[PDB]
């Protein structure tokens, strides 16, 4: 079949969109007349000399903004700001209409946004500079739809989702072909957890433009992850890597996480698990050879090194991630969780419980941190406090499928005794969740259910005990066999009771 | 090991929030949208010549509903004869 790459959609497009759009050489006419100068951006282009030459020859503003775009691609944000500022000082823009000045103000707005994205710091200052530039652009020329797009992005960054949605509604009323409006709307809906609507918007953006930056296929893979169709997510991520082989390490990170999930939930045997896990580790290490300071990769590797009893290096990586990425609360919660897990081996119950509490306060979505907090409460013999905390968590999260939480609730209620019906409900839910997940059901839950049903229904208790015995197989103990024999004795099954006693 | 099993069940669900860096949209990223002031309109009208047919088959497979039938005609007003 036809190869799926960037060259495919290049050949689909006309040669005007193939060669001209990716030119690294800029043609600049001179003020003397027909004379022109061609400067290749592959070489080290000086910002000051190029700006002085452009100002002297008074070239068209398109060349200035194109050079600014190329220096953005080079990462020279300060150089691009210098280009924009000296362009505002140039004679051409001063003698042009306010539309050109508004476009360059919007370019400075995008420069502030790119600096904020590339640094993830000084958010308030860059946001104020971008807001002032966008306000100046809107005052000079309010008819530009790019000003509305910038207003919507500014609202989205400040979490003013309603106003940005209204702006995108106005843009859609103006024209339905705006790809950036669709991408911004999908970003807002994804932020509002409207995954399906953002998925249709991502599909529309992909159909309109398969070569649009940012990549819609990342959002399509995220939506497929939300809809459990992770195979199509991995396929779309591979296609994205084919289209964008550079500066797209996040796609490789998502592919590694999906591979880890597939290894965890699909490995049919220990050897296959070992092979898939080692392949995931090798792929993660290969991704690490490009960037060795990415905090998420260190957090992922911390799990493997914790499983390797390398607690000291886990502590070092966690402290490094805390020092670098203290702004992100999820990394703080994960680092606190791993520190608590490390201290659990040391049995620092108070310290581990405090770390779990800090992880919970940092990110409330970390269910594992709260379950570890409950486990630490059990460790400090705080049975009542753990029970109250577990009841609060269950009542707040009745839809959460935390099977181990329900198993622990059933065991605690069986120990209490008076709440036996809640124990029955939680153990039945645990059994159902384990059956749906195709996970080995713990026979201890069956033993607890039989003990509870002893005072309610001997038949159900005997059936659960038989199921537990079948699960154990050769691991049957003297207590289980004796209780089976007594059950058959009460059932007047003399032969079966005699066999179980034997 | 119970917490290890819980970690295996949860995996990296809540760690995908930071991975939303690709959702951010910036005008300067696209190479050919800026080369002329009206290059945005030129690129918007460059893909009207393309359609679903021009899409790669694997990317067409990615378009999954969350074939035409011969007996559903599109309505007309003048007919023929």
């Amino acid at each position: 079949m036809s190869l799926l790459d960037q060259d495919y959609y290049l050949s689909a497009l006309p040669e005007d969109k193939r060669a001209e759009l990716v030119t690294l050489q800029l043609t600049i006419p001179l003020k003397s007349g027909d004379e022109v100068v061609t400067i290749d951006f592959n070489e080290d282009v000086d910002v000051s000399q190029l700006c002085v030459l452009l100002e002297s020859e008074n070239a068209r503003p398109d060349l200035w903004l194109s050079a600014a775009k190329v220096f953005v691609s080079k990462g020279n944000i300060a150089g691009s700001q210098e280009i924009i500022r000296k362009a505002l000082q140039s004679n051409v823009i001063l003698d042009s209409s306010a539309s050109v000045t508004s476009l360059f103000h919007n370019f400075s707005f995008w420069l502030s946004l790119m600096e904020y994205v590339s640094t993830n710091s000084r958010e308030d200052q860059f946001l104020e500079y971008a807001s002032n530039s966008l306000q100046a652009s809107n005052s000079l020329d309010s008819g530009l739809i790019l000003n509305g797009i910038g207003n919507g992005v500014l609202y989205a960054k400040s979490r003013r989702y309603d106003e940005a949605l209204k702006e995108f509604d106005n843009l859609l009323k103006k024209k339905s072909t705006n790809i950036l409006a669709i991408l911004g709307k999908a970003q807002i809906l994804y932020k509002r957890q409207k995954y399906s609507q953002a998925l249709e918007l991502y599909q529309k953006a992909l159909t309109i433009n398969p070569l649009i930056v940012p990549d819609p296929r990342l959002g399509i893979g995220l939506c497929f992850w939300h809809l459990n169709n992770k195979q199509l997510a991995e396929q779309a991520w591979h296609n994205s890597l084919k289209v964008h082989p550079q500066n797209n390490l996040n796609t490789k990170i998502l592919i590694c996480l999906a591979k880890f999930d597939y290894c965890f939930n699909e490995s049919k045997d220990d050897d296959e698990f070992t092979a898939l896990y080692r392949e995931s580790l090798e792929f993660l290490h290969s991704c690490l050879k490009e960037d060795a300071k990415h905090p998420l990769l260190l957090m992922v590797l911390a799990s493997y090194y914790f499983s390797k009893e390398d607690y000291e290096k886990v502590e070092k990586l966690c402290n490094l991630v805390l020092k670098e990425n203290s702004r992100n609360a999820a990394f703080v919660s994960a680092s606190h969780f791993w520190l608590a897990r490390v201290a659990y081996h040391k049995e620092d119950y108070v310290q581990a419980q405090k770390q779990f509490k800090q992880a919970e306060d940092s990110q409330n979505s970390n269910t594992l941190a709260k379950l570890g907090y409950a486990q630490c409460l059990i460790a400090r013999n705080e049975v009542g406090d753990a029970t109250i905390y577990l009841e609060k968590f269950f009542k707040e999260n009745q839809d959460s499928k935390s099977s181990e939480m329900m198993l622990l609730l059933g065991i605690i209620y069986s120990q209490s005794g008076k709440s036996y019906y809640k124990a029955i409900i939680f153990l039945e839910k645990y059994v159902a969740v384990c059956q749906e997940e195709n996970y080995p059901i713990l026979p201890e839950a069956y033993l607890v259910l039989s003990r509870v049903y002893e005072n309610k229904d001997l038949n159900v208790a005997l059936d659960y005990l038989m199921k537990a015995n079948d699960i154990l197989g050769d691991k049957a103990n003297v207590y289980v066999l004796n209780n089976l024999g007594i059950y058959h004795f009460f059932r007047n099954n003399v032969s079966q009771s005699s066999d179980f006693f034997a | 090991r119970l917490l290890s099993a819980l970690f295996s069940k949860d995996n990296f669900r809540y760690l995908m929030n930071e991975t939303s860096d690709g959702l951010d949209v910036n005008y300067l990223r696209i190479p050919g949208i800026i080369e002329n002031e009206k290059s945005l309109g030129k690129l918007f009208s460059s893909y009207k010549n393309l359609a679903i047919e021009n899409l790669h088959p694997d990317d067409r497979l990615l378009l999954v509903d969350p074939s035409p039938v011969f007996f559903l005609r599109r309505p007309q007003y003048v007919s023929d004869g």
Binding site: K268, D270, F273, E282 | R1
Partner: peptide
């Protein structure tokens, strides 16, 4: 038989022991 075959040590809780049997060297800065 795939339902019973998938039930193994890592599902039973020996996941840490299985990972401990997998040795690999990384280029760690720390």
């Amino acid at each position: 038989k795939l339902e019973s075959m998938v039930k193994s040590n890592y599902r039973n809780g020996g996941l840490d022991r299985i990972i401990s049997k997998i040795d690999f060297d990384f280029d760690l800065e720390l």
